Design a protein around this ligand. Structure first.
Ligand SMILES: Fc1cc(-c2cccc3ncc(-c4cnn(C5CCNCC5)c4)nc23)cc(F)c1CN1CCOCC1
Length: 273
């Protein structure tokens, strides 16, 4: 990881919170190409001091995204570990998380937009699968919109997948249960069951999000009822825009070995026209 000096980073507005983290917009003063000075917008993720013990895992997640380079993976600029703070310095994606964007723009997003975003996410996951790299936290909040659809010039939307944050393999059980139904059943049974099939399940849940205008599946269920939801082997209801319901249910297979490869998922996606 490239170590960035605290002097070169300026914290600005809070954008929200992750698990044991606070997230801010910031500015990084840097020497760019040809020696030109730039003040670059950045995303600053800060681990809560009270959870400093997760630091390793906190950085491990980010490490996963920087091992490979891909057009659909958010860039990591480096880390600031100056002092007692642990800071991730990442690319600032203009339009932010996809779930917020869907909730705000639901009244003007059709099937073609959803299908393009789904294809891009599936392509990112196919890249990860071919590299045998587990993401571990696919969800609409971790999809970021680089640019919007422009029907005037035919441009499709473009998305990037963000880093997964602290791994579910080390998170407390109640956080895992709160993350049903993104966390697959076998990881609720044993968090060390984290596997490639995990991301296929979570991809199904994320498709449900994309199709549901930013609604959160099973949000009306508390943790005990989410557990019970997995115990009775229920599936998510089809979204009112049901064009992807079969794909969602095929990915959210209670048998991890039966979840389809992302190549087959991409084939299915392309078959809808
Ligand atoms: F606060 C968060 C930040 C990210 C995130 C991770 C990695 C890179 C990111 N780049 C930009 C933005 C971002 C945030 N807002 N905006 C603009 C859009 C509208 N104008 C203001 C800025 C851009 N967010 C990024 C992911 C999250 F998961 C949350 C946590 N939450 C996710 C759901 O929404 C609330 C925050």
């Amino acid at each position: 990881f490239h170590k960035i000096r605290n002097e070169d980073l300026i914290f600005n507005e809070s954008l929200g919170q992750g698990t044991f983290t606070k997230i801010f917009k910031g500015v990084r003063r840097e020497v760019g190409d040809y020696g030109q000075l730039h003040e670059t917008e950045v995303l600053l993720k800060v681990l809560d001091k009270a959870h400093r013990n997760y630091s390793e895992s906190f950085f491990e997640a980010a490490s996963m995204m920087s091992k490979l380079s891909h057009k659909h993976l958010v860039l990591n600029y480096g880390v600031c570990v100056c002092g007692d703070e642990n800071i991730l310095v990442q690319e600032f994606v203009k339009f932010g998380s996809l779930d917020t964007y869907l909730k705000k723009n639901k009244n003007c997003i059709n099937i073609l937009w959803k299908l393009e975003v789904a294809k891009q996410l599936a392509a990112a996951m196919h890249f990860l699968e071919e590299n045998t790299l587990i993401h571990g936290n696919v969800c609409a909040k971790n999809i970021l919109l680089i640019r919007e659809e422009d029907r005037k010039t035919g441009n499709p939307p473009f998305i990037k997948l963000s880093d997964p944050g602290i791994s579910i393999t080390v998170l407390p059980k109640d956080i895992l249960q709160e993350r049903i139904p993104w966390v697959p059943p076998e990881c609720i049974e044993n968090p060390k069951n984290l596997n490639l099939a995990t991301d296929k399940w979570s991809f199904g849940t994320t498709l449900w999000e994309i199709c549901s205008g930013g609604d959160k599946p099973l949000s009306a269920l508390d943790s005990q009822r989410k557990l019970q939801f997995y115990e009775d082997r229920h599936q998510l209801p089809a979204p009112k825009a049901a064009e992807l319901a079969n794909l969602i249910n095929n990915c959210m297979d209670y048998e991890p070995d039966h979840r389809p490869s992302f190549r087959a998922i991409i084939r299915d996606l392309n078959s809808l026209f």
